[PDB]
């Protein structure tokens, strides 16, 4: 119930091959991989990249009234090499899609992508000539956030979802020994999981109340 991606530059972005494979997981190697995944998911360094409104809401989440620092994700490096997470928070404009592609290429694996906002998910409200309809047209996105703008705790919830995704994924421990393909778990969708608690809602508070 996993998937495998293998990357190779040498036509159409993304330059990768994905297939549906089975989890291979080893009395010590499995615990070693679990420890590596724990260390990776408990320390994420997001990239200081911003496009639009959604970046302003992301750095609103970065502040002292929500404190995403508690998850170890406040480091916010401005260099792609030092970063460990690309949060596309804003509109993927036509003139910036090469820039975003370049900044994704300068980043180093282990790398993850979080689309924030409707513009980054699908193009959003701007079905216009000068906007790429969704940032996933050329880069693989790990976690999607609906919203315009998503509230800061929605970004925090997406960060925790990315942490659960990292905690159950298989990556090569060393680049000299073993397979270099990336295994990502095909987790159950949050829509299916939350259908049990969402349909049962009966009464809400009327809008005239504060």
């Amino acid at each position: 119930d996993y998937t495998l991606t293998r990357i190779d530059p040498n036509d159409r972005y993304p330059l990768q091959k994905q297939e549906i494979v089975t989890d291979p997981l080893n009395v010590f190697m499995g615990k070693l991989n679990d420890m590596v995944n724990w260390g990776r998911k408990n320390s994420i360094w997001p990239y200081n990249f911003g496009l639009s409104c959604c970046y302003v809401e992301m750095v609103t989440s970065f502040t002292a009234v929500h404190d995403v620092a508690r998850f170890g994700a406040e480091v916010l490096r401005a260099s792609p090499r030092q970063a460990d997470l690309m949060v596309v928070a804003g509109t993927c404009f036509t003139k910036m899609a090469p820039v975003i592609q370049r900044l994704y290429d300068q980043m180093l694996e282990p790398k993850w992508v979080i689309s924030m906002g409707a513009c980054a998910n699908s193009g959003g409200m701007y079905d216009i000539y000068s906007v790429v309809q969704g940032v996933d047209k050329f880069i693989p996105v790990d976690v999607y956030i609906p919203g315009c703008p998503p509230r800061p705790e929605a970004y925090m919830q997406a960060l925790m979802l990315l942490q659960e995704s990292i905690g159950k994924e298989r990556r090569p421990l060393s680049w000299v020994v073993g397979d270099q393909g990336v295994y990502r778990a095909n987790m159950q969708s949050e829509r299916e999981r939350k259908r049990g608690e969402r349909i049962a809602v009966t009464n809400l508070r009327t809008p005239d109340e504060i």
Binding site: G39, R40, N42, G72, A78, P110
Partner: protein
């Protein structure tokens, strides 16, 4: 190997290894403590989820940094690029290697002391210069040039700020300096020397407000932007042992080192060093970054004549009471 001399040599080696392990572990723990203390200063908590109080956040960061891809660019000079984190990690550690933490607990009881600290700072500048030049980047080039200007500014008067303490102790040995303060701590007679050494010692580690090379807002992290993997972690750990070294050096040359009225001496040394570490986090959080041209103007026109006048006054006071 059964002889009192050989077991004494082995005990001294074990004490030096214990000191080295403790200061490296304390530098990493104080990186974590900088995160927590910046949270406290900025009305938040910081990382308090990985274990109890976030105490396992450092282990997770170490795991990520070890298993991050260590990247050497093709357009860079590989030997210099690998050499710069080595200098950044080791120079301030050797600067710490002369600090007496307790009576009978010192690695090397050198006859030079603060001369060795000046030597290690002059060697530590080459880490930043080589990181700026080797990485083959324009932002790194500007950061290296700014670091060179800041180094001019502080190293024109760092030793002269320390010469008041040197003249008061009358020797270059570290233990003589910490024994000359048995009556009065050296911060009160050497106060202008104290503030000038504070400015120069913050400029040693390039900490805020003197973060001209690695300025996040101005040059987008500066010289180590091509740096990644465990080399960037080495840069972090090296700067943090630099902060520990400068804090312990102020403790030894201005607050008696280990000397205290009631508590055991290592406890007093630890409290004063931790207070100066807290002051480093506070000096990062509190006041903004000045322009490096005004920084160099302040370091040349203000600090250097003040150190010279303070040295003259200290010499006159010393020869008056003789």
């Amino acid at each position: 190997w059964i002889s009192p001399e050989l077991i004494e040599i082995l005990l001294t080696i074990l004490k030096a290894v214990v000191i080295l392990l403790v200061v490296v572990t304390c530098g990493a723990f104080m990186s974590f403590g900088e995160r927590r203390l910046l949270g406290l200063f900025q009305n938040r908590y910081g990382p308090n989820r990985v274990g109890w109080g976030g105490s396992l956040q450092l282990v997770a960061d170490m795991i990520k940094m070890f298993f991050k891809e260590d990247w050497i660019p093709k357009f860079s000079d590989r030997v210099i690029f690998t050499l710069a984190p080595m200098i950044a990690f080791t120079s301030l550690l050797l600067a710490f290697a002369i600090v007496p933490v307790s009576p009978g607990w010192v690695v090397a009881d050198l006859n030079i002391g603060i001369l060795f600290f000046l030597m290690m700072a002059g060697l530590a500048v080459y880490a930043v210069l080589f990181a700026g030049w080797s990485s083959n980047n324009k932002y790194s080039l500007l950061g290296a040039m700014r670091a060179s200007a800041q180094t001019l500014s502080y190293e024109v008067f760092l030793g002269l700020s320390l010469m008041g303490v040197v003249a008061q102790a009358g020797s270059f040995n570290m233990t003589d300096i910490v024994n000359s303060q048995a009556h009065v701590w050296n911060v009160i007679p050497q106060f202008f020397g104290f503030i000038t050494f504070a400015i120069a010692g913050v400029a040693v580690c390039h900490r805020h407000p003197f973060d001209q090379p690695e300025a996040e807002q101005e040059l987008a992290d500066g010289y180590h932007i091509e740096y990644s993997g465990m080399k960037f972690g080495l840069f972090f750990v090296g700067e943090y042992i630099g902060i520990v070294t400068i804090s312990a050096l102020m403790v030894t040359l201005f607050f008696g080192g280990w000397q205290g009225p009631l508590l055991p001496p290592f406890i007093w040394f630890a409290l004063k060093t931790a207070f100066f570490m807290m002051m480093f986090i506070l000096i990062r959080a509190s006041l903004p970054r000045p322009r490096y041209d005004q920084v160099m103007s302040f370091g040349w026109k203000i600090c250097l004549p003040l150190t010279l006048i303070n040295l003259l006054v200290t010499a006159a006071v010393i020869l008056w009471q003789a």
